[PDB]
Design a protein around this ligand. Structure first.
Ligand SMILES: NCc1c[nH]c2nc(N)[nH]c(=O)c12
Ligand SMILES: [Mg+2]
Lengths: 49, 313, 79, 218, 49, 224, 219
RNA sequence: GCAGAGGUUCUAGCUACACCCUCUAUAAAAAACUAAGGACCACACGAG
């Protein structure tokens, strides 16, 4: 939430001023950068479900 | 751009830089208890900005976020009163730069002060390995409710007394308090007030403050030595023990459970650490935090009266 | 205000369970409209939970029973 | 330019009838020490009190000696007497005689009245008696002095503790008044033998000081 | 030569004098060292931190 | 000056450039806070075109570390001056003798823990005497680029601002030389072609000592 | 008991004097001797310059032709000026000098009330034969040290004010020579003033402050 | 923006996660709602 989560920062900046101190993790943009920097290397790395 | 100390795996994924941070130089901060640390106002105002906005909205002072921002930048009288609310029970993490081991990053309860330096309880200036020759600590803030509760139930400076490497305590009195206690617990073979009989420590402190008796003097006093020999019960025994005025004054600071065979010797440094360890072992944690906080006050106060200076002779 | 939490962790032995069982109580005091059973005095909503746990008024079972009762009460209104 | 911040005390945390904690929030900057230390030095060693000064055991003349039937030596007996808190009236000197025989502690209640002498701690033990045939008897001398006159600077000689105060400790911490910067927040913890309450002790110790400065009050 | 210079004025030869506490107003036992020391002010000021 | 110095203080100030050593011997004809005029002797002067020598002292100028570089006169009218002699004390230099700090009365003792392990307690008498208040000259620069859609303006007509901020601004859009600006104040007015006016960085509270304006050939010089 | 009275005031020079308080009972002489010093050093009514406006110079860091001193040096010299005012809490002092030669505090035009106690205090030196200087000095009362920062036109300079007439207070306790008593101590206080406040009234004010403060915790 | 349109303000302000209001052809009566573009390399410095 603090460092890099585009849907986490803009959510908790509204949650705090609202009155409730909640959290939503999202997933860091740096990981979405590492995924691209490995996918563009000819190596297919994905996530299961 | 993947491997090495510059790659993602060690620069942008593990060590993400964080918001709600800060930095400043260190100061002695002696008065604050070991569960609280100083904080400049001009820093705590910027750290807790969203909380201030929310509290202003609750008060109705600001209709929108824009007005709240304007009044925060005004730094008027109302904003400080609001800041003294969101700071009440909100721990912050005082993090040293090269945190080698677990005790490097601890929690503290803020106490707003003027100036521009972060204060620090002296007894925790050993676990940090933090000097005062211009060192720089970084202040972080926990935001979520779980984080606030965690920085209270695990990270408060009163929660990690014993280091994880070994059972020995990590808040051992370090430089001035130990010298003051050592100068307190001694004996000169001839000082004014030698061989007298004293009613108790309540009277010894008065007989020393008046100047009628020197700090070191072999005398005879009576002491209520409390014993925990009965399981869960405190047995009170009182015997006319022979000791110095300085040692007798030191008796009132120690809790009741501990015996009298600890504050009677010369009281170097290892003796003080062992005294703290025994207090923790046989009295718990709550009556050891108070004892370790009171011992620093006594040590400083009686190392200031000593005038322990170094001269060529 | 509480500085030493050793009294609380005797009620909840893990002291990792203590934080998780106090966060729910603090949430039920911040978002939820419920009132603290301990007499509140100037304290924030995050140490009131620890104060309640110290008194033995709250543990991992009591709050679950209370939320089950809330569920039953909601079922009553469903008719 | 002569406007001075006069304090307004917030609470008086009275623990018991002999312990208290007086405090003053704004006070004045650098005035906390100037008031607390002055009060400590005036009341710790100068007060119109009264206590014992000298005892004479009818059987023992030499200080390093012991009697029979008592588990407390006269080294310990004389130590139990200087703590005995007694208040008298305008009379500046009176002799107290203690006469009791029987197994059991000789509490302060067994002291002969001898007139208008008042004792604040009847349960104050003096010397526990272990022999039924043993009989203890002595004479207690009291005076209306000041301070604490040790016997080393002066027939048994026992240190006289006239001043009713037993312990004094002041502190000073920052107490900002709202926007105004923090100054001094005096806090005083008094402990008294029991003749007079701590509040009366302070309100009599301040009278002496404020009455000393009577020729320099503009 | 330092001792001779000290004796040239009035100050005690050993170089330590009896200070007095400011708050209490009492005396300091074990007289302490006093004198004049050259003290630079390093430029690592706190206003830039 | 250092109350106790090695003896190499009269050789670091002179040999460096901070001071202004006189290259000719004579007498001081007219001293001032910004210039010193020395009338040379007869022997030390050339037979023709000798005249007299003038030194110009550098007043407050920013240094590479944002500290003041100032020259103060060290002589008075009529005082003879010999060859190779200091007569202009530089920054951190007294009487042509290196002087970096200020001697202070120091007592070694623990004082209630306020000097715990390396801390240094300082009396109010130090601040009152202003024995350590240093100057810090700092430089700011506003640039008017030539972007697309039109160049930016330097004018003082700032939209969506109050009348308070423009009080410290003249007609041409430049702060008055001598104003006391603080954090967040507006220094020079630059409006981007649709509010980009330079502002003092937060915390800085100083007085403008001088303003120098550079103009490119071809564009018109404004009034200021 | 006994009562201390202001028995003797003697002045060794124009700056500092030695007050005396003859009868005091043992221990007091060391309590008053510290109370009356801590009070004296921290709160006394003194007057010091606060705002200096020179005719031609805009800001502090600007040299003025014909003056040897930098304007900053002139301000720092003026901060140490020792003057006392009688009736009005605020006053404006005008200095007008011309011609070569040092200027001194005595060159300031004197009103009915404002009088300078040290007319040898040099402010600035005039070097050029056709140089001149005219400054307005604002002098006011105060208490303690008030920095300039914590307190409109560009041509008005600000100087920190330090209202503190007393510099160095020392006291000692000597045994009295009463013909029939013992343990009676007389007290002597030395007060290195700047020359504005009188000793006896200084002691009286520093004792009235105590008499007001003590009335808090007493009936 | 009920859908379309316009909007007080407190940069800009139907999306950035957005949000609300009044109105019926086009702007004008009103309060409550948010936080922006900054890479690499050399030199010097401080602390552990
Ligand atoms: N900007 C015009 C306007 C005024 N009020 C508004 N409120 C909302 N939610 N959005 C807007 O765009 C506006
Ligand atoms: Mg260091």
């Amino acid at each position: 939430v603090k460092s890099d989560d585009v849907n986490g920062r803009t959510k908790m900046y509204k949650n705090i001023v609202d009155g409730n101190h909640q959290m939503e993790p999202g997933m860091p943009e740096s990981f979405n950068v590492l995924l691209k920097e490995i996918r563009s290397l000819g190596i297919n790395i994905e996530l299961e479900d | 751009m993947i491997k090495g100390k510059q790659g993602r795996f060690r620069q942008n994924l593990l060590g993400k830089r964080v918001d709600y941070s800060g930095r400043s130089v260190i100061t002695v901060g002696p008065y604050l208890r070991l569960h609280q640390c100083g904080l400049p106002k001009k820093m705590a105002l910027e750290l807790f900005k969203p909380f201030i906005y929310g509290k202003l909205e609750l008060r109705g002072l600001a209709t929108t976020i824009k007005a709240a921002k304007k009044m925060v930048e005004r730094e008027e009288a109302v904003v400080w009163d609001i800041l003294d609310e969101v700071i009440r029970e909100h721990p912050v993490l005082l993090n040293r730069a090269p945190t080698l081991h677990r005790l490097g990053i601890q929690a503290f309860e803020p106490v707003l002060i003027e100036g521009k330096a972060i204060q620090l309880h002296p007894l925790v200036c050993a676990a940090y390995n933090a000097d005062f020759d211009g060192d720089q600590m970084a202040v972080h803030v926990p935001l979520t409710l779980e984080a606030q509760l965690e920085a209270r139930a695990l990270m408060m400076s009163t929660n990690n007394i014993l280091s994880p490497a070994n059972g020995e305590p990590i808040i051992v009195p370090s430089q001035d308090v130990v010298l003051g206690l050592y100068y307190m617990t001694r004996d000169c073979v001839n000082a004014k007030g030698e061989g007298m009989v004293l009613t108790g420590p309540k009277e010894a402190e008065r007989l020393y403050r008046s100047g009628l008796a020197s700090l070191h003097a072999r005398v005879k006093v009576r002491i209520t030595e409390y014993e925990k020999d009965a399981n869960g019960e405190l047995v009170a025994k009182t015997s006319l023990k022979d000791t110095t005025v300085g040692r007798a004054i030191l008796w009132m600071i120690v809790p009741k459970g501990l015996p009298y065979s600890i504050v009677n010797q010369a009281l170097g440094k290892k003796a003080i650490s062992k005294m703290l360890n025994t207090c923790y072992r046989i009295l718990g944690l709550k009556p050891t935090v108070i004892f370790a906080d009171q011992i620093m006050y006594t040590g400083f106060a009686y190392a200031a009266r000593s005038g322990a200076s170094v001269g060529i002779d | 205000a509480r500085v030493t939490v050793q009294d609380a962790v005797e009620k909840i032995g893990n002291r990792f369970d203590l934080v998780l069982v106090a966060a729910r109580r603090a949430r039920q005091m911040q978002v939820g409209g419920k009132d603290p059973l301990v007499p509140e005095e100037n304290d924030k909503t995050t140490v009131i939970a620890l104060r309640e746990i110290e008194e033995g008024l709250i543990n991992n079972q009591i709050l679950d029973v209370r939320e089950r009762q809330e569920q039953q009460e909601q079922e009553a209104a469903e008719l | 330019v002569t406007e001075f911040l006069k304090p307004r005390l917030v609470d008086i945390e009275q623990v018991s009838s002999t312990h208290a904690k007086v405090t003053l929030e704004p006070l004045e900057r650098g005035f906390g020490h100037t008031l607390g230390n002055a009060l400590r030095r005036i009341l710790l060693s100068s007060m119109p009190g009264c206590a014992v000064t000298e005892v004479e055991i009818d059987g023992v003349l030499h200080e390093y000696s012991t009697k029979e039937g008592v588990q407390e030596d006269i080294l310990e007996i004389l130590l139990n007497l200087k703590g005995l808190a007694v208040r008298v009236q305008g009379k500046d000197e009176v002799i107290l005689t203690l006469n009791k025989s029987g197994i059991g502690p000789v509490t302060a209640a067994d002291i002969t009245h001898d007139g208008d002498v008042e004792i604040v701690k009847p349960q104050h033990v003096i010397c526990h008696l272990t022999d039924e045939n043993a009989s203890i008897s002595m004479r207690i001398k009291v005076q209306r002095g000041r301070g604490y006159v040790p016997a080393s600077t002066r027939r048994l000689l026992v240190d006289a503790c006239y001043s009713p105060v037993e312990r004094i400790a002041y502190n000073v911490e920052a107490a900002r008044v709202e926007q105004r910067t923090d100054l001094d927040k005096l806090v005083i913890e008094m402990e008294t033998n029991g003749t007079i309450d701590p509040e009366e002790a302070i309100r009599r110790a301040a009278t002496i000081l404020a009455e000393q400065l009577e020729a320099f009050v503009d | 030569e330092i001792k001779e210079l000290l004796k040239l004025g009035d100050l005690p030869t050993s170089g330590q004098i009896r200070l007095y506490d400011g708050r209490t107003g009492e005396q300091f036992e074990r007289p302490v060292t006093v004198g004049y020391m050259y003290m630079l002010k390093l430029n690592h000021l706190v206003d830039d931190k | 000056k250092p109350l106790v110095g090695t003896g190499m203080e009269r050789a670091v100030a002179v040999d460096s450039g901070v001071t202004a050593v006189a290259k000719r011997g004579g007498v001081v004809q007219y001293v001032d806070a910004s210039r010193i005029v020395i009338k040379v002797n007869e022997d030390e002067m050339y037979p023709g075109e000798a005249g007299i020598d003038i030194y110009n002292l550098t007043k407050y100028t920013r240094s590479n570390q944002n500290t003041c570089i100032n020259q103060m006169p060290c002589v008075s009218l009529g005082e003879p001056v010999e060859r190779g002699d200091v007569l202009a004390d530089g920054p951190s230099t007294d009487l042509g003798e290196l002087a970096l700090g200020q001697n202070m009365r120091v007592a070694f003792m623990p004082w209630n823990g306020y000097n715990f392990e390396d801390s240094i307690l300082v009396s109010e008498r130090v601040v009152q005497e202003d024995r350590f208040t240093t100057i810090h000259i700092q430089e700011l620069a506003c640039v008017s680029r030539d972007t697309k859609l039109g160049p930016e303006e330097i004018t003082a007509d700032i939209p969506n601002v109050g009348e308070a901020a423009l009080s410290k601004l003249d007609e041409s859009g430049i702060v008055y030389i001598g104003a006391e600006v603080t954090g967040g104040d507006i220094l020079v007015g630059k409006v981007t072609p649709k509010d980009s006016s330079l502002r003092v960085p937060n915390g800085v509270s100083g007085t403008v000592i001088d303003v120098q304006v550079f103009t490119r050939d071809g564009v018109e010089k404004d009034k200021r």
